[PDB]
Ligand binder design. Structure first.
Ligand SMILES: *[C@@H](C)[C@H]1/C(=C/c2[nH]c(/C=C3N=C(/C=C4\NC(=O)C(CC)=C4C)C(C)=C\3CCC(=O)O)c(CCC(=O)O)c2C)NC(=O)[C@@H]1C
Ligand SMILES: *[C@@H](C)[C@H]1/C(=C/c2[nH]c(/C=C3N=C(/C=C4\NC(=O)C(CC)=C4C)C(C)=C\3CCC(=O)O)c(CCC(=O)O)c2C)NC(=O)[C@@H]1C
Ligand SMILES: *[C@H](C)[C@H]1/C(=C/c2[nH]c(/C=C3N=C(/C=C4\NC(=O)C(CC)=C4C)C(C)=C\3CCC(=O)O)c(CCC(=O)O)c2C)NC(=O)[C@@H]1C
Ligand SMILES: *[C@H](C)[C@H]1/C(=C/c2[nH]c(/C=C3N=C(/C=C4\NC(=O)C(CC)=C4C)C(C)=C\3CCC(=O)O)c(CCC(=O)O)c2C)NC(=O)[C@@H]1C
Ligand SMILES: *[C@H](C)[C@H]1/C(=C/c2[nH]c(/C=C3N=C(/C=C4\NC(=O)C(CC)=C4C)C(C)=C\3CCC(=O)O)c(CCC(=O)O)c2C)NC(=O)[C@@H]1C
Lengths: 99, 161, 160, 160, 161, 160, 160, 160, 50, 161
């Protein structure tokens, strides 16, 4: 300190430094501990989709291959003729398919 | 062509009514996004040549297209690819600035499919190049502003599909 | 729209939008609050503005309402009211878009052909738009009146 | 979903949904809360489920991760865990939907052909799904354990 | 074509020197006058047809030119004269906006005089019509803008003389 | 200038300038103050800009000043610095005009053929323009440097 | 961080934060969006910036990478690029903080001693950071480039 | 080829080939033997010529192979030698055809744009072609040296 | 790569814009003194227009 | 140190009156000049070291003072001279930003003359160097800001001499 400088704390004893920087707060993550570099799982990265997949691409890819109508349908098999309601339903479906 | 403002105006004019609160709200939303759009457009204009450079480097270089007999062989054809990718980037920037992907339909996708089919241009390879452009531009202008650029480049890719 | 106009110019020159054009777009989007307010005001006063403009048109050019004139009956006067409403709406569209392209694309190209097919005096139509401009200027602030008057003057000049 | 299945049946019959089908939809909507809870539990425990499932599967079938196995290398093991994550996501989808329809439509049609082309032991994949079911049942409530185990058993039977 | 800025730039460039104080002052003057120039151009574009109409009526109509035997007789010649006056007004407005008469020099002047001489068009009548247009536009735009507008119109008249 | 461009476009369309074009003209005349400030800065620091950019270019490309190079010799170096001063003056013209037409008309048409005749590396010329650009950007404000960046980059791209 | 610096100062004078300090903190908090945008840009384009800056630096100073140089060899060049990546990360930290404190604490105190010990030319490292600054400035607008230039110049000045 | 050139000229004029054109084709066929000899000489020393050409090019321009250059790594240098092989093959095609048409069509249109995109110095590529021409002239007869140097100089001029 | 069979060779020999872009003549009446050249240009004009 | 605002406030407070119209106008004038002052300060901050470099090159180098036997001969004394010129530049910038020379009076010239007389520093040479700083800064910042910058530098020179 010259003729114009107020003194200030320049050195700390190790005990005082430990009291200041060893509490649960103010303790650095890497001081006395093995810091393992966190990384996302490799399978998560593998299954992760590239790019952002904007809404146009999402809507387009939701209907991508053969249309879902191949599975979203019914097949009318007249298993038994006792069910008159089922027979009528099958007959109406046959009309719809034929005409 | 069309943009967000022209889209709102045409939406009002088809039924002939004036602009109600919803139209003004949509215009306000576009004006809010305008700063981001201008930022991204200026950045992409400044770095247009670079973006196509790394897209070609990480999507097409050292491949069958570039090898002799490849469609990207014959340096005139390579320059044609560079010009076409620049066209895609510029018109995608147009769509991003406008907020509506109609300029792409009426000025880029108009006859482009037939052009490439008649010319033997690999459509999937071009789509991959455009995707690489999307990744590069997203990394260059951030995730949010890059989202719009990705949307419009994806529109171009889907139209070219 | 201003954005569409600048985009078209850049596409014609085969170049990205210049920094000046980007600045213009930025200024327009920032100042959009005033344009939306002007459009709101015009849409609000749509009824009275058109009524006063059409009335003043009628005592300004009674020939159109005279027998033998184009809009003689109350039905034809209603057709004039609809036309002036159309042009007011187009002016509001131009105000919000910040550019005259929507107005020109909607009701300026071929307007001479339309009014020659209809027999309408295009000069009188321009006078009607001028009267709507006067009443709007009365109903608006001076600077706002000037901003709308730009598009009113554009429509009037194109009509004439 | 039951909604889509009922709609498909009704449209195939060209009729509106019957009261029984509507009551079924009501019950499905009512159980949607518990189904959402189970799906959220699985999604939260996602990485855990795949981790212990893969560890137990490799313990039971060390040859698959041994040299010469389909999943020897670290990349191959990550690919197994990726497939396991796929099937866990599909099971969560099915739990949300209340039916095995999403699971079957996404990753159960041609699964045998795909794994035969890849040279993967389909019984090993079934054991992987079984280990996943065990982990989820362990870290999930008893009733929700059975509710998710229904879908897990569906996937396992499809594998076998 | 040239405007005030390009004229100053060329005057400096021919000597191969940077813009000095005088060039900066002239540029400042043009920039200050730009607002009035824009307003006058807007008004003239708004009332362009009426300006030509009134000037023609005041200077040409019901005179020997419009009478048979004058150059303006017949609908075809009348339309040609009206188109000439309209182009005169529009190019004068362009020159007023630019702040320089160069656009008049190589878009209204070269060949106009000898074309009128070949076709027998009355140069004096055209000058009178241009003067009528000048006074009409002065009335429309006021003294300040009318001064510049009449300056450029008189430049056209002198060139056509 | 933008005024000249607007006049040319309006003449090509055979129409008076539109309200958007007039607004752009007003914006340009308003920004003329900043344009003149940037031009005055460049004019004042032209000699230091030219000298520093020339030294940096010579360090980057010793071949041109090396024996057998085009700029070899004190007189050749002086002539090259004169060319750099020419292009700085052109950049000043572009700055004041708000566009690149003065630069393109004066020192960019046929420049490739001209330097090929003179035996000058156009890449070296572009590098000199670049170095002048960094020197000006360093000795100029951030926004003013951005404004001059467009003209400097236009000249550089025309060179390359 | 500006908040941390202000708090430290207020603690040193043993007083609550001044209204001016609070206003400055509030301004920084409001403007943090631009800082986050710049940090995101640098993080996204880190590899490209590092690669281009490395190539430019190697061309400017070939000796450091030629045999007998500090960075000669593929692994030595990899370490040099890793150093450049470290400094880019530090610059991003400084941009996010709004203060050069993180940069000085992590990679500027004892840098001269570290590089003198390693034998690496400190001026060469400064030139590498300068190349990185130039690339980053090119990869963003004038405003964001102007902001990041403060931290880049701070690192360069400390190295010099 | 003079054959296709004369055919195109005749078709454009809608006529049969003139006696002069037929005589020119006759002389071309007569010289075809020596042209084939020169082409075979070039093809035989393909690997050698590219070896010495690349070595001397790297000696003249060490920066392109040094670190940070476009041709630093072994793969980059192999890519250079592949390009040089391409150009020598095109030169052989031109020597066979008696005209520079194949060279221009396959490897000279847009070469500047391609190498600008790739970052390759076009002047350095021209120097490489010059080295190949020198090697071929050294290992060829004097008259054949001039005959091949015509095409080599055409390529060099197109690149420059 | 591959063996480059004749089908692919024929396909790729004409891959992009047809060679007619370069295998065509453009007629310019450079001078009016060559009557043969003028007649050739006129015949070309007829062929182009009709 | 009092800036223009502080000077206005002190003038008002001496009479104990609220801010009158004159103080209003002076504050408005300072606000008007604030943009120019801030731009000049930013430019000088960016180019501070270089300006000192050309100033010393133009003024002092290759002189008797820099040669052995001169005050600037030693490396330490040359570094001190550079530091002194840096002080002059930075505090002139401070005076420019504040619109007043109070800071220059209180800090720069408190005991500068006495310390120079004690240490034997050449007052004439340092005045010439500060003058050269004035011309270089005027050239870099333009005439408008350079005038006031030279005003402050001449104030420093007059106080030192
Ligand atoms: C360990 C758990 C088991 C195993 C798995 C395994 N899978 C692969 C590779 C692939 N797995 C899939 C599966 C799917 N794709 C889908 O879209 C769906 C859901 C709709 C599924 C289930 C695919 C497509 C691949 C290959 C393509 C790709 O990975 O993107 C591997 C690696 C195989 C290889 O050699 O590459 C492995 C190890 N293998 C076993 O042996 C275990 C039983
Ligand atoms: C050293 C000799 C110079 C140099 C060359 C160089 N070229 C590349 C990469 C490519 N070169 C080509 C060129 C052609 N393709 C064609 O079809 C034709 C017709 C004959 C030419 C001339 C292409 C297409 C590429 C890229 C695609 C590919 O290689 O498959 C490189 C590598 C650059 C990179 O980043 O990969 C290099 C080094 N570069 C120099 O600096 C020397 C002057
Ligand atoms: C696989 C590597 C690529 C791909 C293909 C793909 N195709 C389908 C579906 C069908 N493929 C055909 C094609 C043919 N049927 C024939 O008889 C012939 C003669 C050889 C051909 C070429 C047909 C008709 C279909 C639809 C009918 C059916 O699938 O049964 C799919 C699945 C479509 C779906 O929705 O299931 C796929 C995936 N897709 C890619 O991405 C690869 C590049
Ligand atoms: C009207 C005020 C006067 C008038 C007009 C008139 N003009 C013509 C014929 C031509 N006038 C022009 C004009 C121009 N050429 C230019 O380059 C410019 C710049 C815009 C101008 C104004 C031209 C080109 C022609 C000939 C081609 C054409 O007319 O289309 C006529 C025709 C005269 C005749 O005998 O055919 C007339 C009548 N006539 C008057 O009496 C007025 C004073
Ligand atoms: C490059 C990575 C891919 C590729 C492209 C390619 N295109 C051409 C030629 C043309 N490309 C276009 C395209 C457009 N013109 C338009 O106006 C629009 C709007 C933006 C588009 C998209 C056209 C019209 C042509 C023909 C004219 C021309 O060649 O310039 C080529 C070369 C064709 C040629 O004969 O030279 C190439 C190589 N080809 C690939 O293999 C890549 C996947």
């Amino acid at each position: 300190f010259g003729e114009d400088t107020v003194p200030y704390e320049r050195y700390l004893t190790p005990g005082g430094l430990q009291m200041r920087s060893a509490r649960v707060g103010s303790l650095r993550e890497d001081i006395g501990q093995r810091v393992d570099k966190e990384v996302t799982p490799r399978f998560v990265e593998l299954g992760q989709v590239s790019a952002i997949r904007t809404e146009p691409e999402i809507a387009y890819r939701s209907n991508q291959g053969v249309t879902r109508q191949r599975q979203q349908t019914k097949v009318f098999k007249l298993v038994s003729t006792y069910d008159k309601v089922a027979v009528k339903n099958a007959i109406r479906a046959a009309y719809r398919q034929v005409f | 062509m069309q943009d967000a403002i022209t889209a709102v105006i045409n939406s009002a004019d088809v039924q002939g009514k004036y602009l109600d609160g919803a139209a003004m709200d949509k215009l306000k939303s576009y004006f809010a996004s305008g700063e981001l759009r201008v930022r991204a457009a200026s950045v992409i204009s400044a770095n247009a040549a670079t973006i196509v450079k790394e897209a070609v480097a990480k999507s097409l270089l050292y491949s069958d297209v570039t090898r002799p007999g490849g469609n990207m062989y014959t340096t005139r054809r390579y320059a044609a690819c560079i010009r076409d990718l620049d066209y895609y980037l510029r018109y995608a920037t147009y769509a991003m600035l406008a907020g509506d992907a109609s300029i792409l339909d009426e000025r880029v996708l108009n006859g482009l499919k037939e052009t490439y089919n008649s010319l033997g241009v690999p459509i999937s390879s071009t789509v991959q190049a455009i995707q690489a452009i999307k990744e590069v531009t997203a990394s260059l202008v951030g995730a949010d502003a890059g989202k719009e650029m990705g949307v419009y480049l994806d529109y171009i890719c889907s139209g070219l599909s | 729209s201003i954005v569409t106009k600048s985009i078209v110019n850049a596409d014609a020159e085969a170049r990205y939008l210049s920094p000046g054009e980007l600045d213009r777009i930025k200024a327009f989007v920032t100042g959009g609050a005033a344009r939306l307010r002007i459009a709101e005001t015009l849409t609000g006063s749509r009824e009275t503005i058109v009524k006063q403009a059409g009335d003043r048109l009628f005592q300004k050019r009674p020939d159109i309402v005279s027998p033998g004139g184009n809009a003689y009956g109350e039905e034809m006067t209603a057709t004039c009211l609809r036309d002036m409403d159309y042009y007011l709406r187009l002016v509001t569209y131009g105000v919000v878009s910040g550019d005259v392209t929507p107005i020109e694309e909607i009701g300026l190209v071929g307007v001479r052909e339309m009014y020659r097919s209809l027999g309408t005096p295009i000069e009188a139509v321009a006078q009607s738009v001028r009267e709507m401009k006067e009443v709007a200027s009365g109903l608006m602030s001076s600077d706002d009146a000037a901003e709308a008057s730009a598009y009113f003057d554009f429509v009037i000049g194109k009509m004439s």
